[PDB]
Amino acid sequence: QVAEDCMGLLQLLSNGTVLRSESIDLITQQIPFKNNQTVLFKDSIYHKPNNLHLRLYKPISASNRTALPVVVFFHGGGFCFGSRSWPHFHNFCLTLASSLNALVVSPDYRLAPEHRLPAAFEDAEAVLTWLWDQAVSDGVNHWFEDGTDVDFDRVFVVGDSSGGNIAHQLAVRFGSGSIELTPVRVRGYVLMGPFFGGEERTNSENGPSEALLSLDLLDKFWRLSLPNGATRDHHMANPFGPTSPTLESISLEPMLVIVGGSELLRDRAKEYAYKLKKMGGKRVDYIEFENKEHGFYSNYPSSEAAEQVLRIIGDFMNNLS
Amino acid sequence: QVAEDCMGLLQLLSNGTVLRSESIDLITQQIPFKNNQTVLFKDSIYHKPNNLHLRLYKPISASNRTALPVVVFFHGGGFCFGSRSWPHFHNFCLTLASSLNALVVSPDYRLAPEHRLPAAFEDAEAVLTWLWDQAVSDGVNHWFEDGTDVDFDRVFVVGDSSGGNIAHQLAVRFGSGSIELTPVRVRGYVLMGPFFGGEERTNSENGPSEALLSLDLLDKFWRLSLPNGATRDHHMANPFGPTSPTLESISLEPMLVIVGGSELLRDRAKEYAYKLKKMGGKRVDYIEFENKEHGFYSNYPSSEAAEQVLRIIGDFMNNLS
Numbered sequence: 075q076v077a078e079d080c081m082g083l084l085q086l087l088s089n090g091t092v093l094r095s096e097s098i099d100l101i102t103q104q105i106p107f108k109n110n111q112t113v114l115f116k117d118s119i120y121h122k123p124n125n126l127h128l129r130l131y132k133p134i135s136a137s138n139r140t141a142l143p144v145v146v147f148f149h150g151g152g153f154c155f156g157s158r159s160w161p162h163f164h165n166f167c168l169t170l171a172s173s174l175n176a177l178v179v180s181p182d183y184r185l186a187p188e189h190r191l192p193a194a195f196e197d198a199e200a201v202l203t204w205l206w207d208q209a210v211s212d213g214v215n216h217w218f219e220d221g222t223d224v225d226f227d228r229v230f231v232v233g234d235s236s237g238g239n240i241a242h243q244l245a246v247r248f249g250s251g252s253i254e255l256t257p258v259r260v261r262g263y264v265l266m267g268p269f270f271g272g273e274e275r276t277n278s279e280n281g282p283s284e285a286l287l288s289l290d291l292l293d294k295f296w297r298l299s300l301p302n303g304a305t306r307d308h309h310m311a312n313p314f315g316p317t318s319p320t321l322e323s324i325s326l327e328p329m330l331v332i333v334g335g336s337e338l339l340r341d342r343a344k345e346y347a348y349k350l351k352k353m354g355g356k357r358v359d360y361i362e363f364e365n366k367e368h369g370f371y372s373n374y375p376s377s378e379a380a381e382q383v384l385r386i387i388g389d390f391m392n393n394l395s
Numbered sequence: 396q397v398a399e400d401c402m403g404l405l406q407l408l409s410n411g412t413v414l415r416s417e418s419i420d421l422i423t424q425q426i427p428f429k430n431n432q433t434v435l436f437k438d439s440i441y442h443k444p445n446n447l448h449l450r451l452y453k454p455i456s457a458s459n460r461t462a463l464p465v466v467v468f469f470h471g472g473g474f475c476f477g478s479r480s481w482p483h484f485h486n487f488c489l490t491l492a493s494s495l496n497a498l499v500v501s502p503d504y505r506l507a508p509e510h511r512l513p514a515a516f517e518d519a520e521a522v523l524t525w526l527w528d529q530a531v532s533d534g535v536n537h538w539f540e541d542g543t544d545v546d547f548d549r550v551f552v553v554g555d556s557s558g559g560n561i562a563h564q565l566a567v568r569f570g571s572g573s574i575e576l577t578p579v580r581v582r583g584y585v586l587m588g589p590f591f592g593g594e595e596r597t598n599s600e601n602g603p604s605e606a607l608l609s610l611d612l613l614d615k616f617w618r619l620s621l622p623n624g625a626t627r628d629h630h631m632a633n634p635f636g637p638t639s640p641t642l643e644s645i646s647l648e649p650m651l652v653i654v655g656g657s658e659l660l661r662d663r664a665k666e667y668a669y670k671l672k673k674m675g676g677k678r679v680d681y682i683e684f685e686n687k688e689h690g691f692y693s694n695y696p697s698s699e700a701a702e703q704v705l706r707i708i709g710d711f712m713n714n715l716s
Contacts (some may be wrong), residue, residue: 077398081508084401086504092448096437096539100456101489103430108423116417127413134419157411159606161694162483168422185409187402218417285450333397337585373482376697382427 076187079298083154086291091283099194102376111135111172114218117159120204121180126197128181128204129158131167136175142153143228143391145176146201150369152269153186154293155196156236164291166372170232173384174391177224179205186299191239191310193387194236195243199253199387202244206255228395229260232387234372236295238268242313249324261394262328264387267339271296271311274342284367315348321353328357329388332383334366350391361386396464397508400619404475407612412604423697423699430438432456432493435539439479441502441525447518449502449525450479451538452488457496462714466497467522469558471690473590474507474515477557487693491553494705495712498545500526504561507620512631515557516564520574523565526550527576535554549716550581553708555693557616559589563634570645583649584716585708588660588689589667592617592632596620597662634667642674649678651711655687682707 112134120128136142147170149156149163156163156182172177183197195359208214209226230358233241245263247253271292279289296306304310331347333340340362347360363370371383398435434454441449448473457463470477470484477484479501492499503516530547554562566584568574585712592613600610625631630639652668654661661683668681684691684700692704 077402080401080405081398084404084475085509088472088476088478090448090480090503092480093436093438093450096432096435099489100431101434101493103432103493104705105430108697109426110421110646111424112419113422114417114419115414117414127411129414154405155409156407157607159411159413160409160607161688164606165695169422172424180410185405188406216507253396265600285482285485286478333425369483371481374486377428383563384425 075179076298076302079294080187083298086288086294089288091285091288100378112161113168113171115167116218118217121200122199124197125183126182126184126200126202127158127163128179131171131178131180132218132222133171133175137177137222141223141225142175142177143230143395144179145170145174145178146181146204146205146229146231148183148198148231148233148240149180150235150237150267150269151185152292153191153236153299154295155185162372165375166234169375169384174388176230176391177222190301191299194240195310198240198244199247200259202253202255206258207210209258226257227259228391229258230262230264230391230394231260232264232266233268235265235269235369238265239270239311241265242268242270243310245326245329246319246321246324249326250319260327262330262390264330264332264390265343266332266383267334267337268331269295269339269344270313270342270346271306272342273305273307276345277377278341279338281338284336284338287368289338292338314349323351326350326356328390328394330359330361330387332361332371332386333363334360334370335364335366336366337368339368359390398617399692401508404615404619407609410609411465412545412606412609421699434492436488437539438534439538441581441688443517445505445518445587447503447505447521448479449500449522450485452492452499452501453539453543454492454496458498458543462544462546463496463498464546464551464716465500465526465664466491466495466553467500467526469504469519469552469554469561470501471556471588471590472506473613473614474512474557474620477501483693486696487555489672490705491694497551497712498543511622515561516631519561519565519644520568523574523576523579523581531578534665544628547578548580549712551583551585551712551715552581553585553587554589555587556590556690559586560591560632561590562586563591564631565638566647567642567645570647571640581648583651583711585651585653585711586664587653587692587704588655588658589652589664590616590660591634591663591667592627593663594626594628596626597666599662602659605657605659608689610659611658626715635670642671647671647677649715651680651682651708653682653707654684654694655689656683656685656690657687658689660689669703680711681705
């Protein structure tokens with residue numbers, strides 16, 4: 075059954091889409107005299123039993139000037155794909171570190187179907203706990219060859235797709251007071267194309283397929299990721315399932331939701347943000363990049379839209395710091 | 396059996412690698428006043444029975460000046476993954492079109508394990524045949540809304556990984572005189588990290604795993620891609636298998652082999668090139684980018700190395716045009 079779902083996953087993943095008419099894109103040309111920056115990185119184990127590693131990134135010139143804020147980045151891949159070492163994610167983290175002048179933490183987490191939800195969320199908490207342990211023990215001085223100065227009072231979680239869901243789950247666990255990791259303080263959450271789900275479809279979900287994502291593919295991720303027999307209204311997929319925690323009573327930190335206008339997941343993401351907005355006490359910014367599909371910010375690093383996302387995350391961080 | 400291999404593929408694909416020590420990368424900063432260019436693209440069916448599509452790309456300002464050369468780009472993915480519509484490949488083709496001032500043809504091809512080799516090679520030939528048909532029938536005028544001027548006497552095949560293997564297979568079929576498609580003339584082949592295989596391992600193949608590729612992953616691709624019971628010395632994997640055509644007697648067009656210095660596939664690629672070099676009558680350039688892993692040219696578009704690959708392909712094209 076799982077093995078059949080895996081064969082079907084391969085087919086859906088590489089099916090792609092067909093444009094109905096001709097289109098135009100803008101491409102940045104090679105130009106000499108580019109501005110450059112160095113980023114130091116290394117891997118270390120954060121969970122010995124599961125052999126889970128994270129990658130630490132430090133922008134070199136920026137760490138000489140002041141104490142760095144921390145960005146914990148959770149990669150996408152529908153809970154089924156991805157690694158911190160994949161060029162796609164590594165490149166994005168290099169950009170996060172240099173552009174935001176931040177120490178970036180990029181963890182692996184256990185993947186479905188071998189490890190169904192909530193394994194990924196458990197791993198995400200172990201990452202934050204590992205960070206707590208490093209913070210209270212002067213572990214930071216041993217991260218790199220030289221010294222590193224980190225401000226654990228300014229931590230931000232940036233989640234891409236499945237990682238955006240992970241970010242929400244953390245936001246709830248912290249906001250409910252269930253876990254508490256002083257002196258680690260997560261001041262804000264960035265949810266980028268967050269992989270939320272529902273048994274019932276939104277309008278965008280019934281819309282045209284994307285360059286890579288289709289509704290069929292998204293459904294398959296949930297089928298492989300959710301516990302056997304769960305529906306897409308399970309709280310690990312749907313933040314507003316009938317069981318899902320009453321977020322009125324929870325104190326969520328500021329949230330930034332960023333989505334492409336042409337994304338299948340746009341409506342659920344917008345609905346998520348505006349339900350939070352209305353609840354009051356909740357600072358939630360919703361930002362929609364017109365005509366963009368899922369993961370535009372990392373799929374097209376040279377693009378104007380990708381650069382704008384980085385500036386907005388930076389502004390968000392500055393405002394809360 | 397195939398279903399088990401599929402479950403194991405998922406695990407290997409997202410396993411990644413662990414750096415033994417700290418490293419440094421250079422990252423291009425956001426800079427205003429970037430140079431830009433528009434690229435028109437559209438999809439069309441090239442094989443109705445298999446519902447196989449290709450994407451056509453035209454740089455707009457460049458097509459006003461002269462007749463465009465043609466670049467047929469075959470995407471990578473180990474014969475198991477990929478689509479012309481995937482952002483990663485679409486972005487690379489936008490770059491090829493604009494940087495090389497070329498009409499780019501980017502086809503899907505059938506993927507394993509559902510469609511084992513030589514399905515992909517059959518599809519590659521149907522692409523070239525489709526191009527022949529368009530060329531002799533003034534199909535080009537109906538490609539886009541406006542007119543397009545194409546020089547079918549200057550076609551180049553650019554293959555990435557699995558696509559590099561496809562490029563080799565085409566080079567042999569054309570060079571042997573087995574297929575002939577005047578007025579389509581393929582003047583040269585670019586093999587980028589070509590996915591060649593062998594039962595016996597090279598030194599690089601036994602070396603450290605990469606950010607994404609491992610020897611285990613590569614073996615799994617062959618297991619899923621080759622016909623049931625074939626070994627990695629089958630001619631569809633190993634250009635110099637004991638059955639593989641005697642390339643001394645074949646008239647190969649000029650070839651450019653481009654590989655990363657830190658690639659698992661570097662030795663087999665180098666061995667391939669130097670065996671051809673010695674055969675005589677064969678113009679083969681071998682270029683190794685020190686310290687780079689597989690697909691550096693498309694995984695890091697902003698990087699210096701990626702830009703240099705584009706310049707070299709362009710120079711290669713200019714020299715042969």
